[PDB]
């Protein structure tokens, strides 16, 4: 329960103090990873349509790749661990949402799947594990019941985004969720009602919003956009409190990448495409800290930080996923 609270000194290592502790390789670009809620496991997905499950303890220290799953026929684009069960939800450009039961080492295929109308872009498990939020290329957000496979949407169509959903995340308590879209909006949603509470328009000066997460206390949203700026928003007021600047480039549009907190939310981390390095700022002041050279031979499209530890995963178009940890 250590987190950012601007209403009321950091207590964790900068990004620059982390080192690569394990490298894994897919047969195509690796553009998604996710942490299990307990932080012990990481799943990686690739354009080679396969999924790896990785044990963080083995990576720190028997093969770290404890699972490989092959039940997609196109790039996997999103992943979410079931909060209580040994199940991984997977979303692909092959229009499917797959559920994998990974309790058995031998398991290769998914047990159930949802066939979708659009390519999946972002999923977020409800902390109960009974529901999954689904962002697709289509502007309207889907709530699926994991047990009945019925799908539900807000009763007010004006709530919806007006372009592809890029990210969906529940907050820590499930009373809210947050979406970011190609329409350049962040939307705050009621987790029970499933109505849109707030729309942050031109959240990143008109550019696509690539990622939006909550701070642990749910008082803030951290977002990033294709204006290559990370922002800390205060939900209560609807305003940007902190601007994390310095990343990006001139001349071409940047590819999609995440801005994350470290486990204590002392730092905001954003991969920079210009240098293949990780920008790191103090979260409270926006002070630029040391740049972390990532060692990737191409752009990092996905970064996920451990919820519990000073660990994170970087996913690259070089086909590789690098596990980072402050030893």
């Amino acid at each position: 329960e250590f987190g950012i609270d601007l209403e009321f000194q950091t207590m964790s290592p900068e990004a620059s103090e982390y080192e690569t502790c394990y490298v894994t390789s897919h047969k195509g670009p690796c553009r998604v990873a996710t942490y299990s809620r307990d932080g012990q496991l990481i799943a990686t997905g690739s354009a080679d349509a396969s999924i790896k499950i990785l044990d963080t303890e083995r990576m720190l220290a028997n093969h770290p790749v404890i699972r490989t799953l092959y039940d997609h026929v196109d790039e996997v684009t999103c992943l979410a661990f079931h909060p209580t069960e040994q199940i991984l939800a997977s979303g692909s450009r092959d229009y499917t949402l797959k559920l994998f039961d990974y309790s058995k080492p031998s398991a290769k295929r998914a047990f159930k799947y949802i066939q979708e109308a659009e390519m999946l872009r972002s999923i977020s498990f409800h902390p109960s594990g009974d529901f999954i939020l689904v962002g697709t290329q289509h502007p309207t957000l889907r709530l699926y019941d994991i047990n009945t496979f019925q799908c539900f949407v807000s009763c007010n169509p004006q709530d919806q985004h007006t372009d592809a959903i890029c990210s969906v995340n529940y907050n820590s308590s499930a009373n809210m969720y947050v979406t970011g879209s190609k329409d350049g909006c962040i939307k705050l949603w009621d987790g029970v009602s499933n109505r849109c509470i707030t729309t942050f328009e031109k959240a990143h000066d008109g550019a696509e919003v690539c990622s939006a997460i909550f701070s642990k206390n749910s008082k803030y949203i951290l977002s990033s956009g294709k204006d290559s700026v990370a922002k800390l928003w205060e939900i209560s007021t609807g305003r940007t409190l902190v601007r994390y600047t310095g990343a990006g480039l001139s001349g071409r549009q940047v590819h999609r990448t995440q801005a994350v907190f470290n486990h204590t939310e002392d730092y905001v981390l954003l991969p920079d495409e210009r240098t293949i390095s990780l920008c790191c700022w103090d979260s409270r002041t926006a002070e630029r800290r040391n740049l972390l050279s990532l060692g990737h031979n191409n752009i990092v499209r996905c970064i996920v930080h451990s919820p519990t530890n000073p660990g994170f995963m970087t996913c690259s178009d070089d086909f590789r996923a690098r596990f980072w940890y402050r030893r």
């Binding site: 979708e116 889907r142 709530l143 799908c151 539900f152 009763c155 029970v192």
Partner: peptide, 14 residues
Amino acid sequence: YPKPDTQQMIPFQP
């Protein structure tokens, strides 16, 4: 955790 109130919502078919 609270749960989504699906009755306050409308079914959707892609």
